[PDB]
UniProtKB/TrEMBL annotation, chains A, B:
NADP(+) 1 binds at residues 72, 75, 77, 82, 96, 259, 305, 308-311, 313-314, 326-327. D-threo-isocitrate binds at T77, S94, P95, N96, G97, T98, I99, R100, R109, R132. Its cofactor is Mg(2+); Mn(2+). This is Isocitrate dehydrogenase [NADP]. Ca(2+) 3 binds at D274, D278. Ca(2+) 2 binds at D251, D274, D278.
Amino acid sequence: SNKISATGVLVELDGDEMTRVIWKKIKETLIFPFVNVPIEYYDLSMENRDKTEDRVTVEAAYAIKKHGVGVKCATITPDEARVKEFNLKKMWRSPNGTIRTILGGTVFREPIICSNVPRLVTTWKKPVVIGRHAFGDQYSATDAVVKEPGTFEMRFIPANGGEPKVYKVFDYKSGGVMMGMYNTDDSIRDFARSCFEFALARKWPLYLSTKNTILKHYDGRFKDIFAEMYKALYETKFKTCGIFYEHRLIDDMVAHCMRSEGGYVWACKNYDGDVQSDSLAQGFGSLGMMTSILMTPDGKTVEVEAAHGTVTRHYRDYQKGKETSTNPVASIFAWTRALAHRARVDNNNTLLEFTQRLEDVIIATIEAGAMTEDLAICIKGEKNVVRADYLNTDEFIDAVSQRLKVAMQKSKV
Amino acid sequence: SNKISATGVLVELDGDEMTRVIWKKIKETLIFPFVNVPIEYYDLSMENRDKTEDRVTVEAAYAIKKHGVGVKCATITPDEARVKEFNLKKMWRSPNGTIRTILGGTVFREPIICSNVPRLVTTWKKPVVIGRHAFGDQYSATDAVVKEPGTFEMRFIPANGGEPKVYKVFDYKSGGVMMGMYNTDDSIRDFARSCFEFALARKWPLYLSTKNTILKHYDGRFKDIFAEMYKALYETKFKTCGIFYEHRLIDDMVAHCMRSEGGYVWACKNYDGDVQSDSLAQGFGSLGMMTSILMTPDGKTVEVEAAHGTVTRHYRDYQKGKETSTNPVASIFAWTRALAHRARVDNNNTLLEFTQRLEDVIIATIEAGAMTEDLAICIKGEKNVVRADYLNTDEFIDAVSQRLKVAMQKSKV
Ligand SMILES: NC(=O)c1ccc[n+]([C@@H]2O[C@H](COP(=O)([O-])OP(=O)(O)OC[C@H]3O[C@@H](n4cnc5c(N)ncnc54)[C@H](OP(=O)(O)O)[C@@H]3O)[C@@H](O)[C@H]2O)c1
Ligand SMILES: NC(=O)c1ccc[n+]([C@@H]2O[C@H](COP(=O)([O-])OP(=O)(O)OC[C@H]3O[C@@H](n4cnc5c(N)ncnc54)[C@H](OP(=O)(O)O)[C@@H]3O)[C@@H](O)[C@H]2O)c1
Ligand SMILES: O=C(O)CCC(=O)C(=O)O
Ligand SMILES: [Ca+2]
Ligand SMILES: [Ca+2]
């Protein structure tokens, strides 16, 4: 027992506005005093990204790839309002798009549950983790309105000599609408891999949802590639570990989500993931009670972040000297979930114990009535909430620092 | 004072198995003792359809078109198993789909709430009525698997012999998947007309969900057709009733559902209607507490039925001595909602009155503690259920029948 000292290192992406502020409080108060982790720092503030012609962002991604883990603070993505504000050379791409592109992989969203902060769904006791496919179906599609009266025909034209195959879709008298969409086995397969690695690392069962009763070929491909991946590479490791993989109908699975206790990973196609993730987010509680984790298809590499933005509104108050009650636990959990993968890879059970301890201590802090404004709101209603009911960001972080201390001291020699 | 009568006519489709039993019982007990109604009968028992080549189903559907109101009991659909049970004829199409094709219009599903039967979603205080488009999109699409390299290409081919449009969807390098789908302006427009009329007849606001952020042309059309129709034909009448029409992104809208108290109509595209209805089914409680109402686009013709099927496993159970406690209120509410529409068309206030009474009364009875097995388990759980806690089918129907005598009676001296 001394500062922990992991073998491998963590890649830290600093961000902007309110999250950078609390990110600093989190490091100084909750992490570095109790753990001795080697960091590789990269500053993804909007200033340094412009200054460097968005180069930090690329080198942050590659450093994540070499080290295997990265925590990442929320980051402003440029629009036209922000080019004027920050005086930007060009409208730089969203750092999340940039990093994902480079790393590849699939985002999984994990909520954080306390007993005293109720969910909107009375059955939910464990987390339901959605993993979204996120490489095109309707998101890479080609649509057009039909104004004339004509016929919609699909074609596949082999790259070799082979004969065209032509599909007669429909015949328009009055107007209408037409669409085409695609996916690739390479993307489906890599999605399945991330899901399987994710489920195995979390020791949770995995479900895939499709609508292969109606899209027999299109969704049947989804179902088949997952079944190929399971049998070949994962069934055994899953059985050993007390978990399983199952394909279900999207209809079945949204009812299962309503009905069930939770405790599973749920693989969703692009669209379903978009739609159902909003539903689940709402159901579980505040945006400050969920993290996003990108896992690569080999399962070796991981980027973790809070499932919210930089919370600009609360940054406008911080700048104007007002005290602020932004919920920090998504950010703190991003650090524990990051360090947990580090420890797991490195086989550093000591560090693992720290992440568990910290997460556990946060959950108790809230359960004893010490929480931020958003969470008081959930419990007591949008009104019945006075300043005394909640803590501000930093005195909340201090309240868990105090509770981490008690717990942190242990086995003193 | 003796009975209540109406000039207009009610079509009745009678069905089969357990629902057919219940159907008979609620007529004799709850509606005929208080109502003289013109009523044209069609028998949709699986035998009578086989016997009559499925023509009674097409006759029943056209009679509802003529008269404006039908009540339907659940019907067996043909599988390979079902041909042998009754007598083999042919693999006959489902009655619902034939009636739905004949009538046009959109089905709207309405849950029945009581204060003492909790929903899985804490926020739901009012019904959220999903109306599902039910033509096109994924359910009449053309999909296939790509195994060679080559090119996915869409062509629109004007019927006049004009210049065809060629879209260039994707060059596959490894295998993958392809899909083409359509909808028509006519169908989207008729769907829009049902939604505006249904929501107006019920005095609820109306939401459309699309993903027009991504399918700018495909989903944009749904948005544009709804908008242009609201401005032209409905906005005045909605403002006059104190309701509104609003387009929402499908992500925002499923989130809205989770946190809203309800009291609105929700227009869903085919797929979204399919998926989100099952989510709602599980959320609102028993399948015996929800009706379906098909409303044609002119707003004048309605077909109403229970949301569940024939209840086969209560029927095989049925009367081998073995009694049952099937929930009949979805079946009862099918009559009240039909008769309500009958009255509203007729300007027959005394019949409208009667529909409201029997509804209020059924709710009151269940809030009293008299309810079928299904509802008893909801209040708390399979283990704590004994027969002290609930009533059988005939007994519950009688319990409301006696409670109904006292209601109508509040005519005084
Ligand atoms: N990972 C990322 O890099 C990421 C993701 C999303 C958005 N963003 C960026 O963040 C900036 C702001 O975008 P946005 O306002 O749309 O998203 P946001 O930062 O999540 O803020 C939206 C609102 O959600 C509530 N909220 C969010 N986090 C909270 C917390 N920890 N505790 C309590 N309440 C919280 C606040 O509502 P009230 O003000 O009503 O309290 C807040 O104003 C943009 O520049 C956007 O591009 C970044
Ligand atoms: N046209 C229609 O309206 C329609 C719709 C769907 C299905 N069907 C047809 O009906 C037949 C059987 O359908 P199915 O077994 O798939 O669904 P179902 O008849 O609705 O029965 C499904 C199960 O749900 C429970 N349940 C359903 N309704 C109930 C009620 N009113 N009260 C209490 N419990 C209820 C029962 O389980 P417990 O006994 O364990 O409670 C029942 O076995 C099939 O031939 C099918 O094609 C017709
Ligand atoms: O297919 C649908 O849209 C509804 C299911 C149904 O009731 C039927 O088709 O018989
Ligand atoms: Ca979304
Ligand atoms: Ca369904």
